[PDB]
Amino acid sequence: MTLKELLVGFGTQVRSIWMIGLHAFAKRETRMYPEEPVYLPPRYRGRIVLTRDPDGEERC
Amino acid sequence: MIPLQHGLILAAILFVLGLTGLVIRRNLLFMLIGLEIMINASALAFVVAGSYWGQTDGQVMYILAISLAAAEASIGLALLLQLHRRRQNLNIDSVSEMRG
Amino acid sequence: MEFAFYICGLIAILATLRVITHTNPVHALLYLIISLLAISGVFFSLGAYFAGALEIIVYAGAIMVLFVFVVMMLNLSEIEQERQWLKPQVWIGPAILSAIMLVVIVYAILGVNDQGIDGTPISAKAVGITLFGPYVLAVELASMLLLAGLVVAFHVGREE
Amino acid sequence: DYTLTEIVTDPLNVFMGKLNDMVNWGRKNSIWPYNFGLSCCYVEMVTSFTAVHDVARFGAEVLRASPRQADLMVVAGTCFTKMAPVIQRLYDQMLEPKWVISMGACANSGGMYDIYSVVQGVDKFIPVDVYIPGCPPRPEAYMQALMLLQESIGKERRPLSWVVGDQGVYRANMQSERERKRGERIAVTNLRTPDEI
Amino acid sequence: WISPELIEILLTILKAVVILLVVVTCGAFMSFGERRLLGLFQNRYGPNRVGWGGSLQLVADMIKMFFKEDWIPKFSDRVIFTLAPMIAFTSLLLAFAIVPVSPGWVVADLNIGILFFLMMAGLAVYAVLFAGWSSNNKYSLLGAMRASAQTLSYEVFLGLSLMGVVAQAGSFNMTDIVNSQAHVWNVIPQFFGFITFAIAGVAVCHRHPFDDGYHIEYSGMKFGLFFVGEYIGIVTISALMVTLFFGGWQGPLLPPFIWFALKTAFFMMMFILIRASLPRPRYDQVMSFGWKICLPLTLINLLVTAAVILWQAQ
Amino acid sequence: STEVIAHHWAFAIFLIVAIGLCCLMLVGGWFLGGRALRLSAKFYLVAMFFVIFDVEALYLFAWSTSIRESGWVGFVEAAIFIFVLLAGLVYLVRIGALDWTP
Ligand SMILES: CCCCCCCCCCCCCCCCCC(=O)OC[C@H](COP(=O)(O)OCCN)OC(=O)CCCCCCCCCCCCCCCCC
Ligand SMILES: CCCCCCCCCCC1=C(C)C(=O)C(OC)=C(OC)C1=O
Ligand SMILES: CCCCCCCCCCCCCCCCCCCC
Ligand SMILES: CCCCCCCCCCCCCCCCCCCC
């Protein structure tokens, strides 16, 4: 293979190492479940409940 | 204070063991294994002889011996591969067609 | 140094005896590797440090690697179903012949002058000095021999 | 209140109890899941494996392509009729101890696919240790199932050696999470209105 | 029985045992350390819940692999199956057995040194081959022959990459090699030797990016032996290139063992970053790079080194 | 000498303790814990090439430890050796012996 493309490939590998190292110097993106509680938007579709009317009787 | 006689006896024992393995086995692979044993025993005998006289000549002849051993192992294993490719067996008694 | 030499020689003899009498090719190659390690220990006991180093590096690190490669290639097949070499009518004769030759060679060995191998360590520096000194043409024509083996084994061991 | 494989009591010298506790601690703190992708639930599983959730923190990121090295089988996806013998064979290839987590409604019961080509739940043919509802469960639900499995593992009794002692596996009968969380779930009165964010 | 000769014997034996325990514990501790550093490179944490900082994750893994059901395949060769992790552990352990970590702290001050390392590599290829054949699986066998062909293609120039350093030192001994770097470390003159030995050391350890797996039939504690064997190989290769190309224990200010440990730690972290950063080349590309570029580079480097040495000889 | 026999005993103890450690590890793994095709010839070719060039490498290994004691004529001899080695390598590359792809 060509020497020029070998040098280009070596420089590209060095660049990839440099980006991964600088990303090691970055900030963590992990939300620490269960120590950090998961935020859920108010209309999140999880556990189903049956609710009550303002007078206290069941709505169903 | 290690006798030269004992080293030569050990090399001779390994040589005749390799020769016995070369003769009694019909498998070509075991024949090549026996050949490797005999040439390694001869190289060991040269190492013993060189160590008795305090000379590097035994190790030089060992180097030449293992160069030969590597090359003949390569050639013999290529021949074994061709034999297994075109005969589907390694019985060396099967290849006996030319005679008399 | 004496004890190491004798135990390595005994291990090599027993391993070779197991090699020439075994049925499984991979097992036979494994005992052959054990015998090569034992003979390398013999080399190290005699002060031939370079020879033992090459015995593990080349003989027990390249040649038997090639043997193991070829055995895995063959996938070894009318071999264990015969067991013809362990019937006495096959092996008694050659064993008798090898025993006679061993007796003759040992008798010739026992009539030699022995001052004992002192086991003084001979380094690879001295071997390299004499390799490119008194044995220049040995090195060059051994390169040509390796080239011949390379060309022959490439020419034969193809598939087309 | 245990289960021997029969409802028996707790079989647990005091040194054997400490050894069993150490073995259970090492087993629950090192759980190796098997890399098996069936459907969308596997996508949420491997999402939990990534950086924003980091399931590695529990020691459960070594995702094996070989069932021999894996301890945990997460059936995460639909148990199709053609895939069910594959699932059974991969479960059989595993080694003791082995645990099973059904992830998602498909693996739980068949889910929405009550159809001719779907086996209605993976508990029809393999024993399941932890079930996760959801379609798909979110990644932290898979993490919560991992902690449920860890809590179940920490209170089970297994033989220390195959030559000494009782060789039966005693799995604890845990209290159901529904009954445990019924105290805090019913007491909820007001939630945030859906028109906000 | 109190004699100073026996005291020196016990002191040297204790030092060798301490070095062995430290290198095995380092291989295991940075199995865990590879998990943590891959987490660091990938913007996450890794295992940090089992003990303080996750330091007890390794103990839990060790217990789990100990009490996992020991399983040998029924139709497999039992001796070869047991012998493959045996070699994969002990070969690179004995390769580490010649590394000088400090003046006076060396297990074996052999006259062969890197030759002994070459022997250990020539047995590590047997470990891989035996693991492949003993599994009684054709996919594992094909993967093992491919991996062993790769490691032969890079073992063919591992020694020739070391031969520039050997030629400059004029000896095979490792202490002579680290004493020949009293002024300038060997990475500066033997730079091509450095890159070729680094490539060959990564490739013969079967590390990324030089990796139908042959470990699929291995389980229980045999897989743990394979894991710790690869990690001990990483530690051994790092310590060897520290001693051969980066002076070893030589340093201006800090104590020599601290310098050796820092350089080894940097190179092991470089292994982790190499796994995290590069993609996998194709198999034919890997072998063509090994056979067509690196081996002639080692030969030309040896010729240039010999010419430079013989020019400097007055 | 006392130092050389101390180093010999240290190496022996290193080997014995390493063998015992891995053997005891396998024994503890076995003891603890309850219970429940035709390859292509390129493999042979690359292994054969490794064998041949490893023997040539051994010749260069012997040369490299005594370069100063051999002089410039040793450099010329080893240059001829390396040139024959590289001619064989170029020969192998150009005929597709080292090309794994077809
Ligand atoms: C103890 C600590 C050790 C830690 C590790 C340190 C050393 C790491 C060594 C890693 C070695 C990786 C080698 C990869 C070789 C790949 C060769 C190859 O064939 O690459 C393919 C690619 C394209 O080739 P081509 O023939 O054009 O293919 C087109 C066909 N479709 O060809 C190319 O892209 C050409 C370039 C290939 C790679 C050149 C060498 C790169 C080496 C890695 C980067 C090192 C960065 C510095 C490290 C720290 C130094 C202090
Ligand atoms: C026998 C060969 C073993 C190679 C190493 C296997 C163990 C490490 C797995 C690393 C890993 C990979 C590749 C991976 O792809 C992955 O994403 C699903 C992970 O989880 C975060 C991992 O941990
Ligand atoms: C199918 C054909 C098989 C041919 C096998 C040939 C085996 C030859 C074995 C020879 C054994 C000789 C035993 C010793 C003879 C007496 C001593 C030598 C002569 C003085
Ligand atoms: C990855 C590193 C592996 C190292 C294995 C060997 C460890 C040997 C430890 C020796 C410690 C003492 C060294 C001499 C004293 C100088 C340093 C004193 C402060 C530690």
Ligand code: SF4
């Ligand atoms: S439960 Fe839902 S998300 Fe999971 S596999 Fe079934 S369809 Fe996909």
